[PDB]
Amino acid sequence: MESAPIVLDNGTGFVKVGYAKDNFPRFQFPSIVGRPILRAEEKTGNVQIKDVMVGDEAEAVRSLLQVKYPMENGIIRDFEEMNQLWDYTFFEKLKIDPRGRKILLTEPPMNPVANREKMCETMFERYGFGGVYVAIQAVLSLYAQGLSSGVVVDSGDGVTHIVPVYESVVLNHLVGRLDVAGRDATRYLISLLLRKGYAFNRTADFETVREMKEKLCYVSYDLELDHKLSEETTVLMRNYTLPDGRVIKVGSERYECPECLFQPHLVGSEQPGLSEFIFDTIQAADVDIRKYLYRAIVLSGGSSMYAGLPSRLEKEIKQLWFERVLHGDPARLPNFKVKIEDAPRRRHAVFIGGAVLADIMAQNDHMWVSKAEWEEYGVRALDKLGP
Amino acid sequence: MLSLDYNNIFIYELLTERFSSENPSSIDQVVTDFDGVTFHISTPEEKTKILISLSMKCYPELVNYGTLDLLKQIYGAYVHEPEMGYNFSILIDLQQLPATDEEKEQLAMSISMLKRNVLAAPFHRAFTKQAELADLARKDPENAPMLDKQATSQELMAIHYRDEETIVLWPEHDRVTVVFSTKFREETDRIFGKVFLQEFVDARRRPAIQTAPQVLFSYDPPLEIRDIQGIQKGDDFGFVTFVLFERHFTPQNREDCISHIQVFRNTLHFHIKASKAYMHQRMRKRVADFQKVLNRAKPDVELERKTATGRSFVRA
């Protein structure tokens, strides 16, 4: 495959994996583990269910599996299941012997330190990687853009987080989590569909509503317009066919679902949504740099892909500088240049950025935490990895 | 149902329970009725003793037309001091109760029949005075028109029995006339009410139902009620008149006729509501035939074969 560093975005919803200088993930698959179950459902000799089924092998066969997720909110909940993703990732997707390899990992900006420690311990002591580096997921997405300033916001399956950057300095006091992302919009889609009477409360049906959200949802650009189309008109109604063959009608739930990123109170969170979170983050930066942040807001991660999200977010920041800085005076609004970067690749920007960064530091062997350094200092060897 | 019950169902069912019961529980129950009437049923001193009480805004008028002698005739020993906030009250004791199941049944009926027993007093005053005028007119047929003329103005009853109505009635030697000065204030009931009142008059003019009272209608008042209080001609009232002849209140019929004429306006009010429930079931039938006129715009494709729950299937 390659002799250069391996890179692994072990995301909350998808693992993406490959090597330094890859222009796109070598593989990606759901970060799911399954165990065999029987369920008053179809059975077939067309496939054989092993005791542990993971990644693509599980998601293609999940009618037969008790599906479980090793991660939530960007943290590993169960390491015995994350070991069964990492075994699969290295031994039967990449088909590697990890002994002495160097690997780049990722995690979100405010995780428990016990998560990075036990993730590095596992890399040194199950697999025996020769070197490890862990990067904050949103600073990777800035190397993908070929860029060195402008606030980058990453929204994944687990967490939405923001990292302001100016002239290659990373503003660690302004980095932030919004604990609402692509999974809370999916648990919410199940809860909207339950008002229509459709039940999706089996563990294997969660991937079906992920595929449904990912297919049919869009972010409303103007809520009183989509509420007009929703209440006055049939035009929003769309038929989705489940893998069961059942057809379900979905309507206001197309815009009303991804709206929880802009209004977290719909999912019971008191936090401010994307527009108000990015504004209260840029507007907390020092006076000299705020222009260079509004001139380059960078979107990233799969939950930034909803149709209309770049346009809703740009509008909803022009609309919010207008309330909170101009106090509703139109005279200065045309002077407020805000720009959203919303590139075609952006779902993979954390991986594509990781694959750039893992080239920049492939040969600098002191830059990685080495296995030989881990085995003498333990967890204190990770203090190499910044503030 | 095609026609309203005359009694309050709740008091009938409730007393039918307690008169059968081996072990009575306590109650405190206000119970609404038509024409703004309201009952209160409670067990104030013991679970053994039920106090039934009635509230009705026109009861002060009904006491002028001889009501208390009719209620003392009907309820006898069970009559009680009026409950504070109520016009009339009756105290029935479940241990001192009548013996047979048909005595219990007719007492539970009689107590539930209270609204039409309190509102019957002006009708019995008119029927019993028409029985006197019928004898005086049979003594001198040339004096009879003048007895009718004076009874038409001196023996007239008016009851303002709810604020959008008046019932006016009087005896003459061969009849009791009763006029409902009737109004529907709810505008969708006023629109249907024109149809329901018009077709009611036009029904009486057919061979099948000539045996009924002579009904008449207008919107101004009959000449003999044009100066009664609260009757006003311009205010979009309608004046349904029934003429009950001596054959419509013969001794076998009197009690059904009193029960059945009081409920008049309430059957029209009920049937105006129950006609919206009809028009809806007839509208959603025409909607279901316009479906066919759109279905010929869908192109013909077979939707795939599925199990009963909508899951996909693999045979044929």
Ligand SMILES: Nc1ncnc2c1ncn2[C@@H]1O[C@H](COP(=O)(O)OP(=O)(O)OP(=O)(O)O)[C@@H](O)[C@H]1O
């Ligand atoms: N077009 C789309 N429309 C809606 N949602 C999308 C779309 N494309 C991807 N997603 C959602 O993005 C999520 C996966 O994105 P991503 O791989 O960036 O998350 P992750 O990196 O695994 O999560 P995290 O970074 O929080 O650990 C899933 O919820 C998926 O349904």
Ligand SMILES: [Mg+2]
């Ligand atoms: Mg991610």
